[PDB]
Amino acid sequence: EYDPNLKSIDTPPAVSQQMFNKVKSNGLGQYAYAKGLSSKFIESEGVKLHYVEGGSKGTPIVFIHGFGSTWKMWEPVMLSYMKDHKVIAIDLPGLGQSGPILNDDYSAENTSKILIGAIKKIAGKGPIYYVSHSLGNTASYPLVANNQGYIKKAVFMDSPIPDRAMFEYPGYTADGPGLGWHFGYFSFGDIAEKQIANDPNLFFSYFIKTYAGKKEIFTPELLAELIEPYSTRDKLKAAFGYYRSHADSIRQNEALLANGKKLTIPSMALTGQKGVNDVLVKEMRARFVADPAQYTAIILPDTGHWMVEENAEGVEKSLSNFLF
Amino acid sequence: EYDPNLKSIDTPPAVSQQMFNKVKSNGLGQYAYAKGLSSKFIESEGVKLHYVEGGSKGTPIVFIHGFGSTWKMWEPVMLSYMKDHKVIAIDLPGLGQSGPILNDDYSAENTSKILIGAIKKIAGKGPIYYVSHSLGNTASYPLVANNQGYIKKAVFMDSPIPDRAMFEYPGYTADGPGLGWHFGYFSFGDIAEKQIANDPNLFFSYFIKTYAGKKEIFTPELLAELIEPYSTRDKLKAAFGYYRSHADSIRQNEALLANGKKLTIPSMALTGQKGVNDVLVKEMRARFVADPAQYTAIILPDTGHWMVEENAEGVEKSLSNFLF
Numbered sequence A, B: 001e002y003d004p005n006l007k008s009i010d011t012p013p014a015v016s017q018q019m020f021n022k023v024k025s026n027g028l029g030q031y032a033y034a035k036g037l038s039s040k041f042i043e044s045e046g047v048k049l050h051y052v053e054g055g056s057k058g059t060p061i062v063f064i065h066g067f068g069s070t071w072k073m074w075e076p077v078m079l080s081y082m083k084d085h086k087v088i089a090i091d092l093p094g095l096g097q098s099g100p101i102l103n104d105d106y107s108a109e110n111t112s113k114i115l116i117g118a119i120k121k122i123a124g125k126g127p128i129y130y131v132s133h134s135l136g137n138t139a140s141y142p143l144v145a146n147n148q149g150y151i152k153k154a155v156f157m158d159s160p161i162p163d164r165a166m167f168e169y170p171g172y173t174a175d176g177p178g179l180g181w182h183f184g185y186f187s188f189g190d191i192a193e194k195q196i197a198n199d200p201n202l203f204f205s206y207f208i209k210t211y212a213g214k215k216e217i218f219t220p221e222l223l224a225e226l227i228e229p230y231s232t233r234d235k236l237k238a239a240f241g242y243y244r245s246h247a248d249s250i251r252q253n254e255a256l257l258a259n260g261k262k263l264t265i266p267s268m269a270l271t272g273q274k275g276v277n278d279v280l281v282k283e284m285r286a287r288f289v290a291d292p293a294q295y296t297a298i299i300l301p302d303t304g305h306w307m308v309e310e311n312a313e314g315v316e317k318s319l320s321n322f323l324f
Helices: A013-025 A071-081 A108-123 A135-146 A181-185 A191-198 A200-211 A220-230 A233-244 A246-258 A279-288 A307-323 B013-025 B071-081 B108-123 B135-146 B181-185 B191-198 B200-211 B220-230 B233-244 B246-258 B279-288 B307-323
Strands: A037-044 A047-054 A061-064 A087-090 A128-133 A151-157 A267-272 A295-300 B038-044 B047-054 B061-064 B087-090 B128-133 B151-157 B267-272 B295-300
Touching (some): A037 A071, A061 A071, A071 A087, A087 A108, A128 A307, A135 A151, A151 A279, A191 A233, A191 B191, A191 B200, A200 A220, A200 B191, A233 A246, B013 B200, B013 B220, B047 B071, B061 B071, B061 B135, B071 B087, B087 B108, B108 B135, B135 B151, B135 B246, B151 B279, B191 B200, B191 B233, B200 B220, B220 B233, B267 B307
Parallel strands (some): A061 A087, A151 A267, B061 B087, B061 B128, B128 B151, B151 B267, B267 B295
Antiparallel strands (some): B038 B047, B047 B087
C-alpha cells in the first residue's frame, strides 16, 4: 500500500553500481542457488532461457516470476518442495539471465510459446503444476489455457492477468498512485528505461518497499541483490516490453476467454492483502473459471506484493493445500 | 494521444544545462517580457508570486497557466488584448518565478486562497474575467466558485478540473499510456522529481511533444525555453505537489459541488482535440454548470494540449467570442 511517508534513498548511483558489481562478482542474489539446485540454460524459439531446478521424482512444479524478481523469488519454496517434487523456476524471456525477445513481441502468446517449448523439455511429458507471479501472469495465460491436461493445476499470484480491465485500472486514487499508473509509465516510449537505468537503486528501492507489507525485510543488501538483475538498459528494455505488449496480451486473452478457453482445471488466485489484494481474486472468479467449484481464492493477511519474501509460510501452506 | 513512433532525444544532460543557462542568462523564455508588459512580484499568504501585466482600461482578464508552462504561455493573447483590457498572468505558487508553498499544501482550496488575495490587489474591485489552463484548473475551482460576481465569466482549458473521475482515469488504454498514468507517476514519492531533475530535457521533450498536435512547433530551442523553468528539483517538487495534493483537491471540489456551489456565471470549456479533448467538456456540462445555457464548449481541431503555442489565433478568437 502507498505510504506517503516512505523516503527514497540518496545513495549515489556510482556507489549503487559498486553494490551491483559486488553482487555479481560474489555470486549472490540471482546467481546464488542452494544445495540441491542447479542453474542451467535452454534454447527455445531462438531465445536462451535461464532456469534453476531441483528434485527428480514427483509431479513437477514450474514457477514463473514477475517484475522486480527473477527465478530467485521462488528459492525457499523450491527447497521446501524438492524432496517430493521436481521443481523448476525459469527466468522470463529478457529478464534475469534469460536473453531478450529481439522483435520486442512480449505479448502473452509469444512468451507462452517460448516458455512451453522449454517446459516440455525440462519438465517432461507431465502432467505438471504451474505457479505464476506478477508479470508471470502476463506471460502465461495462453500457455495455461492451451495446455490444460499437461497443466493439471495452475496458480496465479497477486497481479491481474491481462484483460479488458487493464484498460480501466486508475492512475490515481484517494490513497495516492493507483494500480494503473505503472502500466502507463512503463509503456511510455523508452522513458522508464532511460530514467530508471540512470539510478535503478533509487527507483526500485522505493518501488519495492512501496508494494511491500513488511518493509523491514528489505535491507540495502537484499535490495541490491533484487535490483542488480534490473540494473542495465537491456534488462529494463525487456521488462518494459511486457508493458508495451499489454494491449496485445489483452486482445489475446480476451479471445481465449470468448473462444472456449476459460480454465476447466482447478485454479487458484493467491494474493497479498497489502499487495494487489482482491483484484485478481475477483477477476478470475468473474471471467476466467468455467466452474467455480474448481476455483480457490486466498488473500494472505499483512502480506504485500513480494509474497514469498514476506510470507513464505503462507505461500507454501496455500500452494500445498491447493496443489497436493 | 500517445505516439509509438516518437523518439526520445539523446542530448547529454550537460549540453541541455548549457541550453537552460543560455535561456536564463539572456533573459529569454519565462524571463522575456514583450513591449508593453511589466514583470512584478507580490506577496500573498506568505508566498511570493511572480506575475506579468499589461494594459490599463477595460475589464481585467486573469490568466492562470499549468504544468509545463509559466505566465509565458499567455503572452501572445496578452499582447492581443492589452490595448482594450488590463491583462494579468500569474505564475502558480512554486512554479515559474513564484516561490513554493512550504507546507506542501498545493490543494485547490489553498492555492485558490493564495491566488484570490493577490488577484484582488492586482486587478482591483472588478469584475474580472478568469482564464485557466492545465494545473490552473486544479488550482482554481474554489476561487471561481466562491467569487462569482467578482469573477464575471470563467474559462477552463483542456485539462479536467479535479473531481471524482480523477480517481478513475485509466493508466493504460488500447492506444497506449492513458490520461491517468501521469497523475500516479507525479504523486509517487519524490521519484518523478528526482528522475526528471537528472535529465529534464529528456523527459519534457518527449512529454511535451506527445501532448502536442502540431509537434513541429516544438524545436529544441523552444523546448529549452519551456523546460528551463522546470529544470531544477525545487521547481519540479512544487509542480508535483499539485499532483500529491490532487486527492485533497478532489474532496474539496466534490464538497463544493455537493453544497450546490456550481457555476452560475457564464463558463467555457476550451480544449484541444489532440490534447485532453472531450473530458473537460463533458465534465463541466454534467457536473459543474448550474445552467447549460450559460455554458460554451469548444474543441479546437488539430490542436493539442499546448493550445496557445499550437493555435494562438483559435484560442484568441474563442476567448474573444465568449468573453467580449
